[PDB]
């Protein structure tokens, strides 16, 4: 008989501990694995695939239309859309990125925001996208917007433009859940010159917008998502 002493914590059950256990089914042989395409190893692998952002959130019931950012022909100087960058809330929240970020407490890294244009091929347009780093207000006019991170996008044969929100930060991590101290800025978009439709054409054209994370990205300290809950256990 070897002398032992038990410490504080004996008998506790910590849902996060990782130890060995007896197998209830001694000697059982599991089914062989066969090959299946698509294996995922890290959630970091999947948040780099871009998905659509319901940017046009202004509706009243969920609709395919809140994915469409409208553009008006012949407007000059004006603003196309605006949003803050709380990736865990608001427009971002239902996107795959938003949806995964919510399983973690802290995030750090660059984001990739792209816009794909869908107007007739014989039209043309020049837009400016601007990222405003924390510390200033959402820009109120392009002059204000153009003094921060921006890209003049020229609509052409190449249909999409990929803007990166480079990680601009004092503190090396921000909370996913809306924190002030930890806030990331604003994203706005304005006409640089203006949309022009060809003859025989009319109305609004739309941009689709996507979001995905750069390879830069870090997420840490897992927790429970506000995105799902329940009141009684389900049954069959």
């Amino acid at each position: 008989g070897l002398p032992t002493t038990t410490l504080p914590g004996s008998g506790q059950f910590l849902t996060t501990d990782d130890r060995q256990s007896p197998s209830a089914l001694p000697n059982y042989e599991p089914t062989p694995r066969i090959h299946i395409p698509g294996k995922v190893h890290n959630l970091l692998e999947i948040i780099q695939v871009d998905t659509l952002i319901p940017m046009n959130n202004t509706h009243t019931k969920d609709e395919v239309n809140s994915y469409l950012i409208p553009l008006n022909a012949n407007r000059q100087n004006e603003q196309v859309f605006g949003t803050n960058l709380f990736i865990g809330d608001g427009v971002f929240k239902t996107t795959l990125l938003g949806e995964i970020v919510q399983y973690y407490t802290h995030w750090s890294g660059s984001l990739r925001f792209s816009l794909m244009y869908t107007g007739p091929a014989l039209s043309s347009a020049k837009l400016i996208l601007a990222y405003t780093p924390p510390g200033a207000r959402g820009p109120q006019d392009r002059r204000e917007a153009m003094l921060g991170t921006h890209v003049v996008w020229d609509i052409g044969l190449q249909s999409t433009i990929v803007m990166t929100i480079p990680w601009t930060s004092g503190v090396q991590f921000r909370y996913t859940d809306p924190d002030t101290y930890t806030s990331a800025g604003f994203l706005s978009c304005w006409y640089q010159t203006s949309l022009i439709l060809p003859p025989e054409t009319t109305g609004q054209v739309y941009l689709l917008s996507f979001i995905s994370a750069c390879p830069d990205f870090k997420l840490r300290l897992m927790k429970d998502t506000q995105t799902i809950s329940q009141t009684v256990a389900l049954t069959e």
């Binding site: 060995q20 395409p37 190893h41 970091l44 695939v49």
Partner: protein, 40 residues
């Protein structure tokens, strides 16, 4: 040290440290180079 005979009884696995998003982010048939035009 495993104290038990069966493999199911061992602790959690250890980090894939595999990581290759290209099956998801770039499943295109003809390879796209960043910087070269998307559609030629």
């Amino acid at each position: 040290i495993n104290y038990y005979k069966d493999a199911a009884s061992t602790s959690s696995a250890g980090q894939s440290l595999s990581m290759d998003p290209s099956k998801f982010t770039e499943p295109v048939k003809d390879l796209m180079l960043k910087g070269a035009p998307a559609l030629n």
